[PDB]
Structure formats: C-alpha cells, structure tokens
Amino acid sequence: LEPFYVERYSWSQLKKLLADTRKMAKAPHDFMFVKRNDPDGPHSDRIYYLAMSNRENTLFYSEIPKTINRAAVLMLSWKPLLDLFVGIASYDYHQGSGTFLFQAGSGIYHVKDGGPQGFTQQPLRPNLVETSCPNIRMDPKLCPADPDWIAFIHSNDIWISNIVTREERRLTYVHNELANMEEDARSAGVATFVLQEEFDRYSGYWWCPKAETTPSGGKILRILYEENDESEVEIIHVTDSFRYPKTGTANPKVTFKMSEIMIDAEGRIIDVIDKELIQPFEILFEGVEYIARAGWTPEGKYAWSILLDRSQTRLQIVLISPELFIPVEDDVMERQRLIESVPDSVTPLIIYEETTDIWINIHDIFHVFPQSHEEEIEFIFASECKTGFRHLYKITSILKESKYKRSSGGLPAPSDFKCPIKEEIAITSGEWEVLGRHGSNIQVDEVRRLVYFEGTKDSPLEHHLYVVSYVNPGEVTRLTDRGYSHSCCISQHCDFFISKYSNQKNPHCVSLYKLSSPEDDPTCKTKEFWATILDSAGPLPDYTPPEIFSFESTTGFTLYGMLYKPHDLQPGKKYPTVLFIYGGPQVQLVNNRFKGVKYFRLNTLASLGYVVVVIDNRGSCHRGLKFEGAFKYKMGQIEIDDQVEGLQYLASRYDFIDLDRVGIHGWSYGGYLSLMALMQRSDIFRVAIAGAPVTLWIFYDTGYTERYMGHPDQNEQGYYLGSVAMQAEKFPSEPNRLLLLHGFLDENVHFAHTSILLSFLVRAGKPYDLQIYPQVPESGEHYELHLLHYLQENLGSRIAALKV
Amino acid sequence: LEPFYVERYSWSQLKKLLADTRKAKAPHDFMFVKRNDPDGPHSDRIYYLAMSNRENTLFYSEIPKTINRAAVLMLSWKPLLDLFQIASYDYHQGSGTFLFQAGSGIYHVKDGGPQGFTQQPLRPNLVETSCPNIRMDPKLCPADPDWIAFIHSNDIWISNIVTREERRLTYVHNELANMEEDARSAGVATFVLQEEFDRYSGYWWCPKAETTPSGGKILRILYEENDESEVEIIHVTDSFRYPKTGTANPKVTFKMSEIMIDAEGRIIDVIDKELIQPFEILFEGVEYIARAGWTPEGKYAWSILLDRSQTRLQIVLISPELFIPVEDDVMERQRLIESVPDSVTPLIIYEETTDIWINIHDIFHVFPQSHEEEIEFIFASECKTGFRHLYKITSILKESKYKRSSGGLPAPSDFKCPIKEEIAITSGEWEVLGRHGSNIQVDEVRRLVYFEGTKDSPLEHHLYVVSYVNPGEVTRLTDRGYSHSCCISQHCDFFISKYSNQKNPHCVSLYKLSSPEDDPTCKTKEFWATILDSAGPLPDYTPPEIFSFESTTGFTLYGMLYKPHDLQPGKKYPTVLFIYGGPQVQLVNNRFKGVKYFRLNTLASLGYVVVVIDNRGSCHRGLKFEGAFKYKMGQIEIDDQVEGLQYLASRYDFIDLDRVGIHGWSYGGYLSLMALMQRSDIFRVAIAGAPVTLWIFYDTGYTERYMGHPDQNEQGYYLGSVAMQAEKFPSEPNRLLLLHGFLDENVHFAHTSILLSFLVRAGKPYDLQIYPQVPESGEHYELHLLHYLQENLGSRIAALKV
Ligand SMILES: *C(=O)C1(C(=O)Nc2cccc(CN3CCN(Cc4ccc(Br)cc4)CC3)c2)CCOCC1
Ligand SMILES: *C(=O)C1(C(=O)Nc2cccc(CN3CCN(Cc4ccc(Br)cc4)CC3)c2)CCOCC1
C-alpha cells in the first residue's frame, strides 16, 4: 500500500484555492398563525414570522389559502410587515388587540395587525415607544392583561411604559448606572451570566397574565422577577469586566420579588408597591442554587418556578402564591404586623420533585391545564429520571395545606412543602427521547386531548414530529417523513405545522402541512402538504456529502460517525486522515442533516486528499442519560478511546486510511479533546490543532463544570486528570505536532486557558505552535489558510514525512 | 563553494546540549572612610554592595597603609550586616549612620563615625512605623542624621530614628481610592522619568538646617508633585499612567516642606509651601524636570529642565524664598505674595539648544560660593562641538528686569543670567561619559577633575584627570587593552576600576593615586589590591573578533564576528545577524561578552557565522553620528547592517549570503521586522523579540526625542511603524517569528497584538512564541530559537523546505 501525498501548494496558492471555493441567511422562524375569520374570503390564516429576505432579520407575513390546487406546488410569497427604507431577534404579540412589540437596535417599536383592527395589505410604519431613559432598553414584553402596558430593562432595573398615555415609571431602584462594578453587583429582572450561557434562560421578569379588578373600578398588574446580588462573585478581565462564577466559587445570591402596580380607571399609575418574600429565599427553598425557569399558571393564580440544587441532581417544580409577598418595609414594628397578616395556609407548594445520580438536563417543556378544582393541579412535564430517556408525563398534584406554621416561629423541614402525587401517567416511553431544548417544545390540543412533540423514536440521527393522546396514551403517530431531520412549529389552533428539514444530500427547506382528522375519530391525525415557505437551494454542485457509518462498541453501545472519502480516490494508495472533533456534552455532530454550510471545509479537505472522520463519542446527546452519564466525574478520560475505536473500525474496513498519518482538530471541548488526544494517544495522532480549548476546569463556570465534574473539592482527582494544563509533561518533545488557536477576547473559554497552558508547556520544556486572532471575515480566512497549510506541511505532503 | 548544513538535532538533544553548556553582582556603590589612626596599619575602610545565588548586601574591606609590592593583595570581604531574623544605601560621614531598605523594612547601623570601626557584623536596627503599606526611597537628612524621609502610598513621610516620631508631610494621595480617581503623587518620579531619563527619586533634603531663635531648627525637603489625571491609562494581567507619544505628560510643579524642630528634636510644625507663581509662568516651555538637588550650602535648590521637544536645556537656581505657605484664604495668600520681594527670581544660570537632541546626564558640580552675585560650576554638553565635554562656567546672579508687583507675566529671557566665563576643560573627537554610573570627581585642593572618556578609542572607556583651571594635558589613568568602569574615592587618593576585554571576564581592582613632590597637579597610579579576581578565560567560550569598515556614509562602523568553530575549507556557512541598533546602546566594544552574549558562541559552535554591527544611531560616537535617524527611525539602520554584511562576505568566502537570519529584542526586534520587510532578498528569517511596531503606542520622553511630535512627522511615523506596513511582509511562511512577554510594561504586548491584526488582515503568515509570566522562560527561548534556526535556516531540511 503506497502512501498518497497531498499537493504542496504555496501560501499564496492555498489562499486563492480557498477564495475560489468559498464563492447563510436566517431561515424563517418564530412563526405565529392568526385566523382571518372572513367567511367570504379565500384565506383561513395569516402567518407572521422573522426571516432574512446581507439583510435585516425582520417581520414578514404570508397568506394560507382555504384551498390549494393539488396538481401544482404553492410557494407562499413573503409580504414585509414593516415600512423600512440592525435586526429583530424576537417579538411579542397580544391576540385580543393585534399588538406586536419588538426591539430593533436601540428602539422598542410596536404595530397592530390581525386584531379587531383587521389585516393590512401594505407594510406598517413601526411606532417607537418614547422614553426619558439615557441607555438602551433591553428585553421588552407586552403585559398580556393590558397591551397598553409594556415592561423593559434599563441599567439592570425593571421599568414599565404605556404606548397610549406616554407614561413611564421605573419599578426597581436596585442599581445606579454611574457606578463601579465592584461597588454595584445588584440587578433586577435580568438573568445572570451562568443562566444565559449554561441554562439558556434569557429573561428574569414575568408579567402576571391576569388583571385583578380594584373595588374603585381600577386594577392591579403584577411582575414576578428575580433579583440578584453578584457582590461575592469572582470578577474577571478581558481586553472591560464582568461577574464569572468559577467552578467551586460563589454563584449570585438570588431571590423572587413581586412588583404590584395599582392602575386607575383612566390607565394612570395610582402607586407601585415592591413586595419581597415573607421569609428569605434560603428558608422557603432550602438547598436551591439556581432558578432554572419561571412563569405563571394560565389564569395567574400562582407563579411557578423550576429550582435546582447546586449539584444539579435534584429538581423541584414549585407554586408561589402572590400572597407569599408582603411589602418592603423599613420599620420593624409596622413590618412585623404584615407578617402576622399572612395566613399559615399561604405556604409554597412543591407540586413535583425528582433526583438522579447523573444530572438534570433543564428544558422548556412545562404545560399547565386550567384548574378544575382548588385542591389540585394537572400538568405535563418531561423527565429522564424514571427511565433514563426524556419522556412526557401527565401529573396531578394535591395542594394540601402544609404542616409547617409560620405563626409558631419555627424553621421549615426539608419535606414540609412537598405535595402528594395523585396521578403520574407516562404519555411516552421507549429507547428514545422527547426533545425539549433549542426551539423543541410541545403543543397541547386540549379539545382533542392530544400533544405534539419532537423526538428520536424513528432514529437518533433524525428529529421527527409526533402526536399522541395524553388521556389514553398508546399509538404515537409520526407526522414528518423519514429521510430528513425536522425542526417543527405547530399552529396554536393545532390545524397546521411547519417543518424546517434537511439531510446530508439536500440544503434546509421550510414547508407548511395541513393537519386533518377522519370524521369518525378526532384523536387520529393525518397531514397533507399545503405550501412551501422557503425552497431548498438544491444540492451544492461543489459539495460531496459524507456517508454516515456506525459500529457496535466494546462499551456496549452503537456509535455513529461521518466519513468524508478522499475525492478522486486511487486504488492501492493510503491517504492521510483528519479527525474533526467536538465530543462534549449537549451536542451531536453526527445526524442526517445538511453539513454543507457549517462543515463545507471538511469537503475542501477531502478534495485535497485527506480522509475526514467525525465520531459522536459517549457524552454526546440524543442517546439518553445513561450514554450521556459515561464521563460523569471523568471528563477527558473516555472520549479518545471511543474516537480511536472508531478510527480502527474504519481502518480494518477501508485501507485508503493511513493510520501512520492521523491529525485531530476541534474548537472548545474539541480543542480540549484534540490536546487530550496528543497527550494520551501520541502513538495514534501525529498532529493536534486545538481551537479555544478548555485546559483547566477550575477556570470554567459553575453551571457547566459542576454538572459534569462535581464541586472540585469532592473531585480533585478528576479535575486533575481532565485538566491538560496540569499534565504539560505528557506532550511530545518534538515540535510541529501541537498547534493552539485562540480568540484573545473570548468570553466563554477565556484566553486564560491558553496562557496558563503556555506557562506549563514552557516549564515542561515542551514545544508548541500558536496563532492569535485579536479581534470578522478576515480572521476566518486566515484560520482556514493556516489550518490547510499546517496540515499540508506537517501531515499530508511529501515534505511532511521527510521532516520527522 | 559547497554549503555547510548544521547537524539536525532533535528538540530533546538540543535541550540537553543547552543544559550541559549552561553549567552575581560585582562590588559596586563603593565609599572610602579614613581610619585617622596613626598606630594602626590601614588608611581607609571601603564599604560596598555585592553578592558572593545570594542576597545583594553591604561588605567592607581594609585598605593597608603599605603593601608588599612583590606580591598581589586580594582584599577579603567582611560582611557589615548580621543576617536578619539591599539595592542602594545612604551614609552620613559625620555620624557614620548607614540607612537602607531590605525587603519591607528600612534599617540603619553605625560604622566609621566617632563611634569607631566594628570588627564584626552589626545588627540592622529597624525604623519602626505605623504605616500599613511598604515604605520606598528612604534618605537621611544630611543636616541631622536622626531624621529620615521616605515615600508611602505616593506621599512623603519623615521619621526620627532616635525619638521614633513619625509624620506624613503631604496629603496628595488617598491609598483607598480608584487609581483612575486619584492620580496625584509627591516625591515620586513618574513612569517616563524613571524609564526614559533614569531619575528614580522625586524629593531632595536641603543639606543644611536654618537655626531658629528658640534653639530649634528648620529642615527643608524640595519635592516634585505630579498630577497624572489627563494621562492615558493602560491595563496589564493592575493599570498605570503611560504617556503615549503626542498625548499628555503629567502636570508637574515644585513644592517645599518646612519642618520646624525644637531643641530636643520634636516636630513643632510642618508648613507645605508652593511656588509664588505657577510652574508654567516661572519656567515657560519646560515639560520635564530631568534632575534636581541643592547647592552644597543649601542656599538654592537647582534643576535641569527640558522643553517638550528635548532641544532646550536650562539649569535653574530656585531660592526657598520663592515658596509661600499653601493658603486657601484669598486675603492671607495675597498678603503672603506681597511679603516676598520682587528681587527674588528664578535664576537661569545656563541655557543651551540643539537641532539634534539633549542627552540628560548625571554630571553637575557646584563650587563653594565665594561671592553672592556669582555661581561657579562644572557642566557637560554636546551642544557646542557635538561631543560631550566638560565646561567650567561662572554665571552672574543679577536682579531681574521682571518685577512681580507690576502684575505682568515675565518675558521668555527675564530670568536668564549673563555668562561671566565659559571655559572648555576637554575637547576632541571623543566624549566624556555621564550616564549608567559614569560621573566626575572634582579635587578642589589640587584643582583637578577625574572623568571617564572614549578619548583613546570608541571601544574602551578609560579614567582621565585634567586641571579645571589651566586645562591642558589629559592624563589617562586606566590601562589600554581593557574597557573600564571606575569610581574615585572622595579623598581623591584612590580609584577602583571594574574592567574586562573580549578575552578576559570582569575584574575589580584598587589603585592608589600619587603626585611627584615637585607638582601636585601631575598624577600617577600604582596597583594596590584586587577586590574581585577574574574567573579567568572561560574554557568553553570562544571570544569574537572586532572588525571595522569605512562606510559610504563617511563613518568607521564597528562589528563583532563569531567565525564558525572547526571551520572547514571551501565550505560556506549560514549567518545569524544579531542586532539592537537603537539609540543609547553600543553592542560592539572591547568588553567580555561571555556572560550576556555567551549563546552567540553556542551558535558558532553549531556552525553559524554570527555578526553584530553598531549602525548609526548607536552611542559613544558623538551627537552627529547618533543624530543620523532623527525623524527617520527604521529607514537607515538596516542599510548599515547590510553594508557591513556585504563587506564581511567579499572578504570571507565562508559567509553564505543566501542563508542569513536576523534577531534582536526591543529596538532590535523592531529592526529584525524592518529587515525582512525592506530587505527580503538579504534576510531569510527575522526573529523579533518584544518589537516596537507602532511609534504612537510608545512613550513621550523616548519617541518625541528621536522622531518629534507625530503632527511634525506624518511620513517618519508611517514609514517607521512596521504595523502600518503589514502588506510588505513575505507571503511564504517560516520566515517571521515573533516573541513577546504578555506582561511587558515597556514594550506592551499591544505592539505584537496590533501587528498580528494587520498580518492577519493582509493574509500574511507568522510564527508566535509567548512567555506569559523565572529562569524556565529563558531556557525555552534558547531552545525554540536554536531549533527554529536549525529547522528554518541552517539545516539540510531547511534548504529542502523552501
Ligand atoms: C467553543 O465552543 C467556541 C467556538 O466554537 N469557537 C469557534 C471559533 C472559531 C470558529 C468556530 C466555528 N467552527 C465551525 C466549523 N469549522 C469546521 C472547519 C472549518 C474549516 C476547516 Br479548514 C476545517 C474544519 C470550524 C470553525 C467556532 C464557542 C464558545 O466560546 C468558546 C469557543
Ligand atoms: C527590550 O529592550 C526589552 C528586552 O530586552 N527584553 C528581553 C526579554 C527577554 C530576554 C532578554 C535578554 N536578552 C539578552 C541577550 N540574549 C542574547 C542571545 C541569547 C540567546 C541566543 Br540562543 C542568541 C542571543 C538575548 C536575550 C531581553 C527590555 C525592555 O523592555 C522591552 C523588552
């Protein structure tokens, strides 16, 4: 078997090759369906959505016709909703009023469409909400109970503002803008760094969906909101500064407040009353580090929250009555009578609790039914805690008065607020997961008593949409077609769904499907294609898709991989191999989706003469908790076995794979594994290129690290064995084998990781290559040029093998 | 001619080679104290600082009245201090008090005063404090050695070492405050003055106490007070005030603490005094306080003041009568301003200009005042002939035409003093040295001045003496064949020389000075004793050859040549040019290069020709030679380097002109980048360590001296800033390697960072090594550099690789 040698391009030639082959718009999303209710007209529904038509991500609408010509294919045209001469990330809407609300740059704007006002046939001028606030307003939201009222965040404080009356009032005085960050670490209504980065919770305030009428003929509006104290939280610097909770250090001090807003009959503010918890957060919610999720019951009787312990191994869904909140009062005497005024019946309610020896994966599935009985609550939730696969469970929990009495002056026991479980029915089950993250949610038809959900049942390589009864769960009907991964949205009216779908051969597509029922059984569901929203571009002419492969592993699981065969393959000749790797939690690289946009350059590599290989090792997602839990406390210790195992699977089954000439490359967790690879399996991997790698888990945040690696105090040996900075001595003593790439201003994986590795590589007298991108298209081009040139001169080419 | 290829070693082999080949401060800050004991054997005790891996500390040696002139006396080092349960020191002849900082503490001891001479180590006595933070820059009051001053959290404090009384004199800085919020300091020299003018202290004791009626006294401290509020701020892995070229330097003034002491040495009172008119009014156009002190009797403070362009120097006398108590009360203040007579004016005793630049030095000697309207002093200047010579000046202290009471502002020449006389003491195509320890010692009895100079050669420093009265015969006291660094005893009967040459490691020796009985002004020297024996020629080290070549520019240029060891006939070798090439430095001279530049030898042992050349701009060749790159930094240095390379090559067939690398640090890293950028044909690889890449990112004091304000020099700043010219770099990799420390506070990493941005944006390849924070860093550097040169310049694979 002869070794193949890649063309040795000059730097100038490689640059040109890359510029020619290079020669990604946000596909429509945030769909909403509004009925036309016009019997004489041709359209059942208008859909609104966000999309890029190098453009503003903006609002569009399309017309859903009552009938189609089933001989032809209908392509909906995109009608601009706004009169435009930055972007719109998200929008808010109120059905009764037809009020849209959204941020675009510095301005909060609003418009009406689809309400009592009727339906525009032309773009609307966005109406700016006037403000006196110096700085940018963030995270605006319509009050669902009065669309004249919005809320927003200015300088880490909650404000409300009336789009009719022009009235603007600050609700919280927790922070002053002209201040030092060491001086002021307090914020209200804003989710802190760890909750954004590690739990994907972006908002920290929640309009109560219902009014309460005042006897005068006015009303009370309400805002549940998280208030955070970051005083005790590590501060770090980047070429400004922010509060980063390093693993094993302090997370922010947290609590629930409730802003109660009295409005008169003319819609002017009478008074604002900031309320606090009757007993400090730490008493009422023992053991709870993070507020993962919060909102309200549909009628606003209770607020709810999903609460986690620091070790993220215990989850509690808790009901919080507005009555548990008493005004913020200076005088002890006056304050003392308020606490007596609160009855002992008004206690917190833990409607659900679960635990695992692995970890809770937080998700966006939680549906509450209307309350049929004061003493009960009925809800759908998803959990891996029963079977080790995320499944939907319909639960009834009893709102028993607690044993604990505040009047007595004692402290509450652990299980004092636990609620009995009347009913806990599994709606789904199997060796596959319900998806509850990154847009994946459920839709509940309360009339037909059905629930639409996305899942891995047909294959862990493809997402499909499914329906099932939550009343007598059995048959799970798949609604999307096989041979594609789907990302779906269901109309609130549950008579339509939209799928964004693709596969390795074909670019993403967006289609609309009409849902029907046979007249004899409403619970049974069929789908018919209705219209295209976004036509697939079509197979890329210059792009050759990889083949998906699998192999039963010695670890007892199937492992899936992608193999990019060298273009123009020669017989008898063995080729140099590049392993591209992520291999960390919460991510799957290997699935039936178009990889031609993001991983187009794995194709470019194949074109130069490299075998390219990707493998989802254990710890990767869409394979259930047991498969994910394999590296718990042992990050870095197993992933490279699985990668090597798969590489030897392929090498015995194909002989164009030259095992003497394997390179590995990855960003973030991949950068980490690329370093671990050269360190542990020096005999397999000739070169390792580490992009922005984790090199020292003690330099990484609480929410992520402690979930997978525990508190460092109780896992020094795992933290040590998983930290490449601490094991510098194990790298090769010959150069041209280790390449480090890092953004200087990285705020997720600090440059700190790369510098601390560099000081330890120097102490250990080890060689290294480094590249830095100090601030942007120009950086990307330099990366790809440097990567291809490094692989050529140090792996692929003639001169590379001479160099040893 | 068949090309030599260096043995291709592995990383682990090279690391081992460096480690095998790898297998302490010389006596300094000397002082001579007379024994004054007729029956005893010794004339003098000498105190000095030295290490014998060890703490730098105080030692003394015994100078014998006589020696056996057949033998060689090695002085033995007696430790003066007892180990505690030192970088500098102060001394007070009359009392024999030593004062010095050792770690966090200020200690003191007595030797050689009335209390006599110890025969054993003394126990350092701690100066007790209530101050939370570390005390800096302790100094004895020359008027009363019970009192010291020191700096604490950027304010001046005093402390009596007998009474233990402690008092803060200035209230300018709040320690517990944001560094951006509080930017005032007192008695402390700011970044640019330490870093670009080597002034380290910001306050000066008046050397005399004025007696009061009560039997008490008044002690005086002149101090600088700085406001750094408008100065740019930069942050490193805290933050500090860095004046970027063309931006604001600190706001500066003179202040004076009057300290009333009673007859038992208790502080009665402390009065803070400010200039009667602001600094900007009294000293028009002055930006920098370069130097300051007192006249020997304490009648005047003195100062050497520079303009922003560093082309005007003034020496100014400042009477204490010029300061008034700080009074926020308008009525009181006006009354105080009226009470100070118009006859009391700053006296500019000297003023000079140049179209090149002023070079600040440490030479300034004031003679005892013999008349009230005359001051007699010795200064040094390049401004008359373009070489630094000593001038004896007498200036007339007339009453000024400006009268404060007329409510006007003074005109630019109102404070200028007539020059009664200006006499050259030295002259010639050579310079008096006045920096890095070089100064004069004036003998006021025999009317002679000892000084250091390049008179005999630009490659050797020598000690010289000459009369300052009928200047003529300059006598060389040090011996030819060595570069010397010297200190003269205050009694002027001895001198010490730390000397070396290319072949021999540094040595320190004591010489006795004598006069023939018939002429005290004639001076001879006799060897007396060795203070530190030379290690002897290094066994493993092979000294380079000093060469020179007559440049087309019309100057002799000097270089050093390391011939490749075990030289083969008919074979040509790869050449490493090592470079600094910048102002204020000379790499090529007759000194031992076996410590600092030992690795240039290692290179030659591996089969590399090594070249070093002092291009124009380098020092010790006078102001005209230095002035070559005025406004044009980066545009001429590499021509000289290449001229000397081409010269060596057309004389030696063993230089492979097709395989030249260049390497340096700082200015040398700059020129290494400039080299590959302008002379791509000559240089295969540039290794740039801590390069300046953007002249607007460097400081005021240095950059504006050599390049002026950026507005006056758009083209020089552009052409001299390599980061502005990233597109002129090679498109082929393994030619450019950058080395930087992330924490550099002189050449910020920012220079490397901005360069990388433009290299990326221009699609250019580069290599990078970083030292994040320590002897392990140096070893890795040496290891990466030798291996890099092997792989990419001098080995067989290197030739193949192209
Ligand atoms: C890690 O999580 C994180 C990071 O991912 N950083 C990062 C930096 C730079 C680029 C990317 C995107 N990535 C997309 C896939 N490409 C594959 C590839 C391209 C080109 C070639 Br020639 C081969 C393979 C690589 C680049 C991601 C993000 C969070 O913060 C820390 C850094
Ligand atoms: C520039 O002025 C400055 C600087 O000099 N930095 C610096 C950093 C690290 C080391 C040195 C010491 N330098 C001594 C001379 N060596 C000669 C040599 C050694 C080894 C080999 Br293999 C060849 C030649 C080189 C290193 C100096 C200091 C001021 O601030 C900016 C950085």
Curated annotation (Swiss-Prot), chain B:
One Pfam assignment: Peptidase_S9
Residue stretches in coiled coil: none
One GO cellular component term: cytoplasm
UniProt effect for mutating residue 195 to K: 13-fold reduction in affinity for Ala-Pro-AFC; no effect on subcellular location
Catalytic residues identified in the record: 666, 744
Subcellular location: Cytoplasm
Keywords: Aminopeptidase, Apoptosis, Cytoplasm, Hydrolase, Protease, Serine protease
Catalytic activity, EC: 3.4.14.5
Expression across tissues: Ubiquitously expressed, with highest levels in testis, placenta, prostate, muscle and brain.
Protein name per its UniProtKB record: Dipeptidyl peptidase 8
Protein function: Dipeptidyl peptidase that cleaves off N-terminal dipeptides from proteins having a Pro or Ala residue at position 2. Acts as a key inhibitor of caspase-1-dependent monocyte and macrophage pyroptosis in resting cells by preventing activation of NLRP1 and CARD8. Sequesters the cleaved C-terminal part of NLRP1 and CARD8, which respectively constitute the active part of the NLRP1 and CARD8 inflammasomes, in a ternary complex, thereby preventing their oligomerization and activation.
Gene responsible for this protein: DPP8
Annotated Gene3D superfamilies: alpha/beta hydrolase, Dipeptidylpeptidase IV, N-terminal domain
